Design a protein around this ligand. Structure first.
Ligand SMILES: [Cl-]
Ligand SMILES: [Cl-]
Ligand SMILES: [Cl-]
Ligand SMILES: [Cl-]
Ligand SMILES: [Cl-]
Ligand SMILES: [Cl-]
Ligand SMILES: [Cl-]
Ligand SMILES: [Cl-]
Ligand SMILES: [Cl-]
Ligand SMILES: [Cl-]
Ligand SMILES: [Cl-]
Ligand SMILES: [Cl-]
Ligand code: NA
Ligand code: NA
Ligand code: NA
Ligand code: NA
Ligand code: NA
Ligand code: NA
Ligand code: NA
Ligand code: NA
Ligand code: NA
Ligand code: NA
Ligand code: NA
Ligand code: NA
Ligand code: NA
Ligand code: NA
Ligand code: NA
Ligand code: NA
Ligand code: NA
Ligand code: NA
Ligand code: NA
Ligand code: NA
Lengths: 87, 180, 180, 180, 180, 85, 85, 87
C-alpha cells in the first residue's frame, strides 16, 4: 500500500514513459504483496485489455525499472513482473 | 430551369439547416442504447472479440469501424480485437451451424457486431444464436438491439456519431476517466 | 470516476449540439467549391471518367463514393463511369510517368478525384499533371482545389455532406432540374 | 489403417508422376489457342485494355493474372493495361446493357478476358457482345474460345502454364524476339 | 524474327517437357516436410487455427489456400479454422508485441502459416515467436521450416502441389484413411 | 417541330414511368435534318444522356416508332440519338 | 461394446450417406462410463471430428437415439460426443 | 537511313541506357526524315505499347541526347522528339 504508491513514482519519474501513458495505463495498476515476493512482483489491473496491453507494451520497462531499484522485492537482481485482473 | 449557382446556394443552406435541426435526434429518444454500449464495452474490456458484419449498403461503414478502432498510427492505444467478419471464411452462407461451431472453436470470446439489413437466413440464425451481439438493425430481430430508421436521409451521419459515441465511451472507461 | 450513465448522457448532448453548432460551416465559407462541382459535373456529363483515390485514413470514404454513385439497385439511374483508382494497377508507385501514359491510353477521358493526404511523390506528380482533377485536399497543391481541415473533429461528417452535395448537384443537372 | 509416413511417401510419387505423365497435354491437342493469343497479343500491342474476370473458384487466378502482368517491381517492363473487372463497378448484374455501354464509353479499347464458369446471365450477355474477348471457358459459349476440362485434377496447374505461355508470347513479340 | 506460330510450337514442347522433367523434385528431396505436415495436421485436428500470411508476390496463393481449404460448396467437409492474417488488423507493423499479445488473446490456439519472403521485422518477430508455425520460406529463419527456391521458374507449380499434398494429407488423416 | 408529339407516344407508353419520361425523354429533341424515313435522329443535351437513353430505351424508341405513323414510312425505323453542338 | 449397433441404425438411416458414415460416424465410439439413460456419450479421435460431427449430426443422433430402444430409457435422450484422452 | 543507324549508336553508347533496354526498346525505333526537321525528330515504333512506353520512359533521354548532339536535326538547341506507330 506504501510500496504501491511508490513503484508508481519510479514509473512516473521514468524517461521512456509519458504523462498520458502513466495516466491512462500505469495509474490503474495495483500492487499484490500476497503473491509478490521477491523474484517477482504482482500487480492487478482492473480488466483484461489493461492487463494485456500494459504487459505487452511496458512489461519490460517494469521488469527493468524494478531490477534497477530497491523496493521490498528483494535480491532478485532481475525481478520478474506479473500483472493480472482483479477478482 | 433554375441556375446551378443559385441552386447550389439554396441547397447548401437547407442541407446544413436540416442537419442542425436533427442534431438532437440521439438524445431526444435516448435508449437502452447506453446499456448495449455498457455490455459491449464490458465484453471488450474482458478480452472478448468483435466480429463485425454489415449489409451490402454499409461496407464503407464496416471499413470505417475497422480503421477507426485500429488506426494506422495506433500511438499508445491498445490493438483492439476487431474482426472484419464479412470478409471471413466463417461468414455463414449454407450452414450457420458450422459457421457457428467453428467460430466458437477458433475464438476465445467472440461477439457479433452487425449493422444494417440481415440479408440472409445464415446470418439471421447466428445473430439469433447465444453468442453475444451488438445489433445495429433496421428491424428488431431481438430485444437488445439498437433500432435505426433505414430510409432516413441522415442515416449515414448517425452511424459516425454512434460509432464515435461508442469509441469514446469505450476509451473513457478503459482509461478510467469514467466509471462503468 | 463519474458514472458512465450520467457520462454518456452529457456526452450525447454536447455531441449533437456541437454538430448543430457547426451545421453552417459549408455555407459559411462557400469558396470556389461551386465551380469545381460545375466543372466536374460538366466533365462527367461529357462522358469523362472518375478515377477515385484516397489517403489510407479515408478508404471508408472511397468505398462510400463508389457505392453511392453506383448503388446496388441502380433503379433508373445511369451507370456512372467511376473507378476505384486506389485498387488499380495504374496507381503510381515507382514511375508516375508510366502510370500517366497508360492511364491516358486506357481511358477516353479520365479525371482524378482525390481525397485527403497525398501520401507519395508518385500521386503528387499525377495530381499535378494536366489530366482534369477534383481535389479534396488538406493542403493546396493547386488552386482549383477544395480545402479541408485535416484535424477537424467533424471532418468525417463533412465528407458525406460534400459528397451528398456533389451527388445531388450532378443529378439535378443531368435530369435538367437545374441549369449549369 | 496405413501409416501416414508411408502414406505421404507413396502419395508424393504418384503426384509427381501423374504430373510428368500429363506434361504434354497442351501440345498434344494444340489448338486454335495460338491464334487467340495472337489476336489478344495484337489487341494489347495496339493499346487496347484487358478487363479480367473469373468464376468464384478462380479468384486466386485473377489475382495471379493481375500481379504477374504488372509485378510489384516492373523493372523495365511496360505498365500493361490490365483491369480487375470482377471488382469493378461495371461488372454486369442487373443490366448488362448499361454495363456494356458505360464500359464502351470509359475505355478506349477494352477486351474481356474471362476464365471459368459464366455464373450469371449478365456476364454471359457481355461475353457474347461484340467487344473483343479472350475466353478461357468450360463450355464453348462461342467459336473463338479456349476450352478447359473443369473437373481435371490438374486444372490449377494448366492455368499457370497457359498464363505463362501467354505472358511469354506477348513479351517475345513486344520485344521483337518473335514475328507475329 | 522467327515466326510466332513456329515459335509458340517449340515453346509449348519445352514447357511441358521441363515440367515432366522436374516432376520428381519433391520426392527427390523429401526433407522433414512430412513431420511439419504431421504437426500442422495434429495442430488443426486439435482444433487450433491457421493464420495465413504471404509475401506480396504470393497473394494469389494466400487466396488459393483460403478458397481450397474452405471451398464455396463445402459439401460434407468441415468448416476449417483458416484466417487470412494478411488482411487482419493484427498483422504486425509497428509493434509485433501487441500483434502477438492480442492474437494470443483472441484465438484459442493459433498457428502461423507463412509463405514466402518475410518482408518486415514485425512479421519476422512473430514467426520467431513461440506460437506454432508452418513456415514455407525462402531462407531458413528456423529449423522446422520448408525451404523453397525463390527464383525457380517452377515455383508457382510447386506451391499448388505442396498445398495439394497438404490438403490430401490432412483429410486422409481426419477421415481415418491413414494413421498419423 | 410539331413533329415532337413523338414525346406523347412515349409518355403515353406502358413501359415508361412518369419520372423516366421527365428525367430522360423530355430532354430529347428531334432532328429533321438528318433523319431519313428509315431513321429518326434526336439530340440529347449531353453525352451521359445520349448514352443512357440509348442504352435503356433505344429499343423502346425503335419499337414505338416502327409501330406508328413523318419521314419514317419504314416498317422498322432505326433511332439514333446524339449530343447537340 | 456390443452396444455399438448404434452405428448400424446410423448406417441404415436415410439422411446419412455412405461416405458420411465412413468419413465421420465409423470413427465414433461409445462411452458406457458416463452415458446415463438420458444421455449417450461417444468419443471421437480428435477435436475437429468431435466438433463437426456434433455440429452436423448431433440432432440426427439425438433423433435416431430417442426413436429407438440400453441405458437410454428416455423419451428424448441427449447425445454428447468428446475427444479421447 | 544513315542518320537512323547513328541516332541508335548515341543511345547505345549512353550511360543511363542498358543493353537490354536498347535491345528490347530502342532498336525497334526508326527514323522519319519526312516529318522530321529540325526542331523535332520523328521516329516510328512498330506498335502502340512501344510508342507509348518508349515515349513515357525515354522521351526525355531522347530529347536530351538529341539536343546535346549534331545530327541533321539542326539548330534546335532543344530538339523535340515525337515517336509514332507505323501505318
Ligand atoms: Cl458478405
Ligand atoms: Cl455471457
Ligand atoms: Cl494504394
Ligand atoms: Cl513515397
Ligand atoms: Cl484524420
Ligand atoms: Cl472526440
Ligand atoms: Cl463478382
Ligand atoms: Cl475489332
Ligand atoms: Cl500485409
Ligand atoms: Cl519493415
Ligand atoms: Cl519470385
Ligand atoms: Cl520463362
Ligand atoms: Na485530459
Ligand atoms: Na454477459
Ligand atoms: Na452483405
Ligand atoms: Na449509404
Ligand atoms: Na428524412
Ligand atoms: Na465525438
Ligand atoms: Na473517430
Ligand atoms: Na477500372
Ligand atoms: Na507503378
Ligand atoms: Na500536399
Ligand atoms: Na480485330
Ligand atoms: Na464470380
Ligand atoms: Na481451384
Ligand atoms: Na484427372
Ligand atoms: Na514459362
Ligand atoms: Na510468371
Ligand atoms: Na479472422
Ligand atoms: Na500493428
Ligand atoms: Na528471411
Ligand atoms: Na537473351
Amino acid at each position: 500500500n506504501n510500496i504501491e504508491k511508490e513503484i508508481l513514482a519510479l514509473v512516473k519519474q521514468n524517461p521512456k514513459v509519458s504523462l498520458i501513458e502513466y495516466e491512462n495505463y500505469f495509474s490503474q495498476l495495483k500492487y499484490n504483496p500476497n503473491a509478490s515476493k521477491s523474484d517477482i512482483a504482482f500487480f492487478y489491473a482492473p480488466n483484461q485489455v489493461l492487463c494485456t496491453t500494459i504487459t505487452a507494451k511496458y512489461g519490460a520497462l517494469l521488469k527493468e525499472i524494478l531490477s534497477q531499484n530497491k523496493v521490498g522485492m528483494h535480491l532478485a537482481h532481475s525481478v520478474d513482473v506479473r500483472i493480472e485482473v482483479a477478482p | 430551369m433554375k441556375n446551378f449557382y443559385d441552386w447550389i446556394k439554396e441547397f447548401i443552406r437547407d442541407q446544413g439547416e436540416f442537419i442542425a435541426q436533427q442534431s438532437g435526434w440521439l438524445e431526444l429518444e435516448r435508449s437502452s442504447y447506453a446499456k448495449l454500449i455498457a455490455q459491449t464495452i464490458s465484453h471488450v474490456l474482458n478480452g472478448g472479440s468483435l466480429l463485425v458484419s454489415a449489409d451490402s449498403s454499409r461496407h464503407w461503414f464496416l471499413n470505417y469501424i475497422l480503421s477507426n478502432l485500429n488506426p494506422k498510427d495506433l500511438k499508445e492505444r491498445p490493438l483492439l480485437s476487431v474482426i472484419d467478419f464479412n470478409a471471413s471464411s466463417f461468414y455463414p452462407k449454407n450452414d450457420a451451424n458450422l459457421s457457428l461451431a467453428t467460430i466458437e472453436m477458433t475464438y476465445q470470446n467472440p461477439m457479433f457486431w452487425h449493422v444494417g439489413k440481415i440479408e440472409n437466413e445464415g446470418l439471421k440464425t447466428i445473430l439469433l444464436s447465444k453468442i453475444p451481439s451488438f445489433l445495429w438493425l433496421f428491424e428488431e430481430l431481438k430485444e437488445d438491439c439498437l433500432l435505426l430508421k433505414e430510409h432516413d436521409s441522415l442515416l449515414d451521419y448517425k452511424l459516425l456519431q454512434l460509432f464515435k459515441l461508442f469509441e469514446n465511451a469505450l476509451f473513457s472507461v478503459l482509461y478510467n476517466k469514467v466509471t462503468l
